[PDB]
Design a protein around this ligand. Structure first.
Ligand SMILES: C[S@@+](CC[C@H](N)C(=O)[O-])C[C@H]1O[C@@H](n2cnc3c(N)ncnc32)[C@H](O)[C@@H]1O
Length: 392
């Protein structure tokens, strides 16, 4: 099992996207797509094919249990959350906490002080920024608004902190339930957010549904409201962190195209704390250069209002940017993710009946990787006076 003993830690994956000097026209017709879309389409079929390879295991509950066991066993960062939570006084240290924390430590944000964290429940992202802010930035006070589809708040971050969340309980249907697929909710959330916290230097949105062959597609309207909320609230100079997945659909591509008009730097990122076997990505915009015009605002909300995945811009005008995206898709999905799904199927085959053994083989490797993470994203102990109030 040498192939096991040689597994190496992943690297943080960061792919720069070019800003578009040119003025942004939001399309109202369909345009013939550029050739390169066939390439993204070829990536979608391939990535979907490898994923399919676990289909046979998903038919009997027995093999499906062994499948998740095997996936658990290969998760090199598993007991890191608990090490982090204890060693350093951290809170809501979900896997989301590590991702946001890793993002904070890599991206060199110019500012992380005024955070609007949307699709945030429970609140790992919020906790990560609180902790990073008070132990690394030392911002005198840290102010944040949050919102999420009202259901979960396992830790009582919504219950204890109601002057910060922007969505209502059903008992208020009378009303914004934090659902970012309703256009009127996104307008309202952005307004609320900018109504009690100015400016907004950091917007984050970690939304997703779950189900894999149409995961991106199922999530388009969600990832569009997510981003509409941000772009309607993020103040000039502010920063942005958005959860995406595959990035092969022409809408997603056109959405990234919109973004490239609004930041000094734009990147597609795959943090080591993002499972290497899933398609999760984090689009990251540093230094917002300008706000929406009043026309740009209306066109996008109406598209949210009456939604179709037709591209928002003429993709042919963004050839260079598109070549950069595919390069992230080649790096994150066609290589890394496919390399790691193959690796997990291989493990499954040689260890479906020997889980304990696989875990024994990988213990040394695990400690080294979690240790590396901690040395890469230095963590300090959070002062109890700077902790978030939790009701659970
Ligand atoms: C992966 S969790 C994100 C939170 C992350 N675990 C954290 O604590 O940082 C999924 C999130 O997406 C949100 N979400 C999913 N669909 C949504 C929608 N249509 N509108 C608003 N939020 C949505 C959920 O409310 C939830 O907070």
């Amino acid at each position: 099992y040498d192939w096991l003993k040689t597994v190496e830690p992943t690297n943080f994956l960061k792919i720069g996207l070019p800003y578009q000097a040119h003025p942004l026209h939001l399309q109202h017709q369909a345009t013939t797509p550029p050739s390169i879309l066939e390439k993204f389409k070829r990536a979608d079929i391939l990535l979907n094919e490898v994923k399919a390879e676990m289909d046979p295991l998903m038919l009997q509950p027995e093999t499906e249990k062994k499948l998740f066991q095997i996936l658990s066993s290969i998760d090199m960062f598993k007991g890191l959350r608990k090490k982090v939570e204890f060693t350093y006084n951290a809170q809501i240290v979900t896997n989301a906490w590590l991702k946001m924390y890793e993002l904070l430590n890599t991206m060199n944000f110019n500012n992380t002080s005024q955070a609007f964290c949307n699709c945030e429940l429970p609140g790992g992202f919020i906790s990560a920024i609180n902790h990073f802010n008070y132990t690394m930035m030392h911002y005198p006070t840290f102010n944040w608004v949050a919102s999420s589809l009202y259901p979960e708040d396992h830790y009582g971050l919504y219950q204890c902190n109601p002057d910060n969340w922007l969505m209502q309980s059903p008992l208020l249907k009378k009303y914004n339930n934090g659902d970012v697929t309703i256009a009127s909710n996104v307008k309202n959330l952005a307004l609320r957010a900018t109504q009690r916290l100015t400016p907004i230097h950091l917007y984050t949105a970690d939304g997703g549904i779950n189900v894999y062959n149409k995961q991106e597609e199922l999530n388009l309207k969600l990832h569009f409201g997510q981003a509409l909320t941000g772009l309607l609230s993020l103040s000039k100079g502010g920063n942005m962190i958005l959860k995406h997945y595959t990035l092969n659909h022409a809408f997603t591509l056109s959405l990234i195209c919109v973004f490239s008009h609004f930041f000094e730097e734009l990147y597609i990122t795959k943090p080591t704390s993002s499972r290497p076997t899933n398609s999760e990505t984090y689009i990251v915009g540093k230094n917002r250069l300008r706000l929406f015009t009043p026309k740009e605002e209306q066109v996008l909300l109406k598209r949210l209002e009456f939604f179709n995945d037709t591209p928002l811009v003429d993709l042919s005008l963004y050839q260079n940017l598109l070549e950069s995206v595919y390069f992230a898709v080649e790096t994150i999905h066609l290589k890394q993710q496919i390399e790691f799904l193959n690796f997990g199927m291989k493990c499954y085959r040689h260890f479906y009946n020997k889980i304990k053994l696989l875990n024994d083989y990988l213990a040394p490797k695990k400690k080294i990787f979690q240790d590396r993470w901690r040395v890469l994203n230095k963590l300090y102990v959070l002062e109890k006076k700077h902790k978030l109030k939790l009701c659970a």
